[PDB]
Design a protein around this ligand. Structure first.
Ligand SMILES: [Ca+2]
Ligand SMILES: [Ca+2]
Length: 117
RNA sequence: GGAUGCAGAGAACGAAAGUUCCAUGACGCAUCC
């Protein structure tokens, strides 16, 4: 249930900004903490995996992000989301809570994502 | 065992070889049935 389709280069930009934010920022991984972070108005930018089965697990996300005005982006695999923070483990969804040092980069990314809508 | 919440990384058995679960939330900590 993709709301939009992100092109490959933009997906790579987001997945790379994720690894750069790892150090100086704060990132959560998993559907529980990500949903909480969006509901509490903490998530700067959320990532949703495309290969989630059953897809109903992450389906509630885009509408909640629209409710709370949180930019969401679809990434190809949940394994591409496994390096988000801490232990290497697959993640159906993640969320950058603090941009950290990469402020303008996240700004450009959310501009490009809004461009897709 | 089951339900609910809090938090979010490895956890239980084993001398270890290994066996079994875990961000689709294990392990826990409570309250209840
Ligand atoms: Ca261990
Ligand atoms: Ca032991």
């Amino acid at each position: 249930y993709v709301r939009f389709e992100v092109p490959e280069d933009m997906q790579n930009e987001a997945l790379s900004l994720l690894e750069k934010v790892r150090e100086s920022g704060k990132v959560k991984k998993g559907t529980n903490s990500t949903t909480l972070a969006v509901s509490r108005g903490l998530a700067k930018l959320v990532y949703i995996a495309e290969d989630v089965d059953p897809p109903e697990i992450v389906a509630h996300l885009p509408l909640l992000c629209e409710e709370k005005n949180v930019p969401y982006i679809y990434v190809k695999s949940k394994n591409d989301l496994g390096r988000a923070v801490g232990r290497v483990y697959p993640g159906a969804s993640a969320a950058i809570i603090n941009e950290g040092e990469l402020r303008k980069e996240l700004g450009s990314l959310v501009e490009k994502i809004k461009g897709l809508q």
